[PDB]
Design a binder for these strands. Sequence first.
DNA 1: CCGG
DNA 2: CCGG
DNA 3: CCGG
DNA 4: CCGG
DNA 5: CCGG
DNA 6: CCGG
DNA 7: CCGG
DNA 8: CCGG
DNA 9: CCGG
DNA 10: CCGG
Lengths: 196, 196, 196, 196, 196, 196
Amino acid sequence: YRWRRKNGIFNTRLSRTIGYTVKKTTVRTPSWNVDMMRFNINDFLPPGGGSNPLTVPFEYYRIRKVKVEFWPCSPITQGDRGVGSTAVILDDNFVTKANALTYDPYVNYSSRHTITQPFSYHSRYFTPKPVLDRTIDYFQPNNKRNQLWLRLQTTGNVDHVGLGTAFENSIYDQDYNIRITMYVQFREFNLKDPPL
Amino acid sequence: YRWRRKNGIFNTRLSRTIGYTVKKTTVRTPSWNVDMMRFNINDFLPPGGGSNPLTVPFEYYRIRKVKVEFWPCSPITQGDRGVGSTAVILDDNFVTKANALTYDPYVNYSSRHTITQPFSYHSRYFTPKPVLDRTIDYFQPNNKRNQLWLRLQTTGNVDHVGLGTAFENSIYDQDYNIRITMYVQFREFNLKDPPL
Amino acid sequence: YRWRRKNGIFNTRLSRTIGYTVKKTTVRTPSWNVDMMRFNINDFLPPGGGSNPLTVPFEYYRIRKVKVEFWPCSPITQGDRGVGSTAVILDDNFVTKANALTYDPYVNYSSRHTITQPFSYHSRYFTPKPVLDRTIDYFQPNNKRNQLWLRLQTTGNVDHVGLGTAFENSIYDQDYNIRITMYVQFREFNLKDPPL
Amino acid sequence: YRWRRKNGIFNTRLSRTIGYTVKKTTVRTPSWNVDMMRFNINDFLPPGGGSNPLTVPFEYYRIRKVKVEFWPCSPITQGDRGVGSTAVILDDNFVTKANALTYDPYVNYSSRHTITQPFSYHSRYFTPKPVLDRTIDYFQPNNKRNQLWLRLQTTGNVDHVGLGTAFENSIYDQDYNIRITMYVQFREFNLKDPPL
Amino acid sequence: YRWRRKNGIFNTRLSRTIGYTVKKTTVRTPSWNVDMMRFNINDFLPPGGGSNPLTVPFEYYRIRKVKVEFWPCSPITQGDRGVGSTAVILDDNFVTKANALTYDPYVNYSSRHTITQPFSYHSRYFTPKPVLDRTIDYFQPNNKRNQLWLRLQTTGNVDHVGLGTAFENSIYDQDYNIRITMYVQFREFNLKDPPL
Amino acid sequence: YRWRRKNGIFNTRLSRTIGYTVKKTTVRTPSWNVDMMRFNINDFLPPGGGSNPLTVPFEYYRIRKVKVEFWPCSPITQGDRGVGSTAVILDDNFVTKANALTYDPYVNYSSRHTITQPFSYHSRYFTPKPVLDRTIDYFQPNNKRNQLWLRLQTTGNVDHVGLGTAFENSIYDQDYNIRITMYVQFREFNLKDPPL
DNA sequence: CCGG
DNA sequence: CCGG
DNA sequence: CCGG
DNA sequence: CCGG
DNA sequence: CCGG
DNA sequence: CCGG
DNA sequence: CCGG
DNA sequence: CCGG
DNA sequence: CCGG
DNA sequence: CCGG
């Protein structure tokens, strides 16, 4: 029952990069540094110009998958190692941002995938969900056919969600180089062609 | 296409109990007493304590089914019997609360299941729907795979809906003992374990 | 998995009619006249009376299809012909209303179906979508089973969407006689029957 | 042997519109009005902005097909009809532009497709070729696999070629509304994403 | 994938004739006389007249094969015989023109076909290539389907290439009668027919 | 249709080596160092002597494949790691040479293959293309049979193309030892043999 | 010889 | 003749 | 009654 | 009970 | 790693 | 690694 | 690594 | 045209 | 009409 | 229409 098909469909990929810095602490007991992570397409698609407001000429879109990647910045020979946890949060209900917490809150989460620290690579390939209603915080299951479409706005696209972190603090700085790869699916090729 | 599977899924059951009292009237013509019925999970799940805010350690949820039960409180030997009607209302558009109405408004509803009164048992096993937008009042069909998930909030869970009643008035009080059994499906086991 | 079935389902049809007048212009270069088109069921269902607020005794509804028809009003012998375009817009993001634009913006749209002007007939049989959130502008694919239901309100039904036009200006007036046929599917027969 | 495959390939469509005006003449003998037609993608793709110079984020391209369309502007009731000819010219060697020529030069061309005038529609769906060397004027056959790729420049794209016309003059003006639809195939998705 | 077919295709043959004179020398050591050979269609097709500039009414062309023939002019009873070599040079990089060279440079060439001298017949049936870029000197393999087409210019056709010679000097003159047969393939029959 | 075969064909390999030095920077935000990479056979084939101008006795050539190799020079114990990107650029349109750029421009390129830095090995085995026209920047697909041949010039061979880099800056120098292996295919063995 |  |  |  |  |  |  |  |  |  |  249609079943995509050709009506403007253009599956593609997008990626960006950012640094994340887990700081030092004189504390020696196991303490974690919690932080969330949001996804918004405006940080991937820069603005176009003229009658075409975006750089990609399409109207609708829906994010199929996201591949986060924690490419580290610390060396192999770093000591005071640790262990962390990454979990998938599909409702904009993260666990409060904290620099030092006495436990790993994302450890018993069913979507937990362990992190080895501080020199290892960790990746999480999942389906995010959008924030339609913050008061109610609803979202639908993972079904490709009946997944929703969303207008590709110019400046006010909705904040997708889907990941929260908990890194174990250490004496030394644990710098990281995060890469947020996104697998998008656009529709309704809406290019304009004025004269001149 | 996943197809639940194990990722925190915990099907269970919940139940509560309340009294409902259809009062007397000197009127002898057939008159009905209309009233609605709302379902909210906060009335089933009491609050937890500490880092775990709820009593059930899960994040998401979705109500599969509801089984209302009208366990009466009147004896078999009660006279001035009557006949009522229960209907399923999935849009928060009930029929105005009234102590005496000259007709059964929920009689021609396609979801009508007759009530015998005042000493009989009546049950309604159906799928409720949540109230996402009161202005628009939309809801989706009954499909288990693509049913929505909802964040399990602490104090502001959304008011599910799905039943309205119309009991025929009588000279004698018609007390009832309602039992609202709920069949829920949670996800993302999110238990915390601080020290001490 | 139910799979409609009989529970109040009444597939039917509705239609209305309106005039649309593309005006003259002394300009001779190709210039277009852009305009959108919205669909709201209150313009099809007039109000009832008494306990039954609508003319159709049903509670829910969902629009399956819409068939727009541009029955012209100009003769065959009209000169300064042109060419236009109709496109499907499912997000309430039309292209700004304009009396004279130097290009056809809806020409490269994947949902484009060409118009011959000014004496030809043009029809567009498609599935519209409702406006649930204007800020986010989301909508679901075309799937009959899992399509949403909507409460049939009395005065504030939601504005469905799905078509935008671009007619090429001409020296002569290009009057049209638009017919908006709608294919609706109601549910939950909710007729009242007071006495008298 | 690869055989496109996925490496940035995005088949799409582009279109524009222009007026063409065959003027009157007091001459009554059969006389033709010859004119060529060139295709350049800069007239279809407007310029982008910032690090992305174009509106379409791709590097290479190759035009598969072109569909010219002579949507007329004259009425059915126009007299002094005529007959013309359209031919495919793949070498930038057209036949000299002339307002009145005593014969149809594009009539015996093997790629001739007759035009009925002045109120009929005529279309030509063919494969154009680029202008690599004007001195030598070479071009390759129609083979999809081994067709060349071309850099998608910002302001100096090469002038594709492939059509020449010969319309029969008439007492009355024969205005037309030409539509040049292009079927392009891009490659190497080269989008940039600066911060801010 | 078309696969010629009928669209103006006219395979034919052309031929011309010229004398080539290897001169005497008092030298008795083996010495060779090197010379190249170029092919240009203007030496085969004389100019037409009027609107038809050429004698053959076609637009494009591509040379499939060339058959050079060294019909000698010397008698059987000639002494001081020798031995030479003919090679195929597809890049306009011949070996410098020389009246006396101490070796046969075209002897080890893979495309070498020996000549017996001075009274024998020698023929070379090969596919030439055009000179598209002298700086780069590129050419494509022998494939009939994907061979290039070339505009049939009036006075500036491109110089095809493909043969170089090395004849062994002798006391007596070695006159030859060269015949350059060409197997051409035209396209796009472009005949004009003015009145009178 | 010939289908190489023996007519001088000599597939072989060539290789060279060079150092590439990504310098330090006090900047700590993610910044990249962009640089291109060109391939010219004169850097692989040194000049011969005498009548044979090259070291390899052949006339034509065509580069089938190139294998770049980033053999690092930094130790395993180096900190402030990073992440880069290599992409294939077949049109001589690289991304401007820069010592510090706030983003990875070659990240979203379809031909992107990630680099781990600074102690890892990275290789890219691809088919380059030559620079026939800088103004137009055309190139043909990857097809072995119909790939072009090129004259093997002595001092002015054309600059093949096909790779661009983007390395992430770091506090420490990131020296590399690049190896450019080339897989060439020659033709027309053209050796000379003068006396003495 | 003729030769797509 | 070309010839692994 | 129990009910995915 | 619901019932085309 | 995740692990009934 | 080698790679037609 | 790439990933619909 | 009618169109689930 | 749409058209890989 | 194109048409051996």
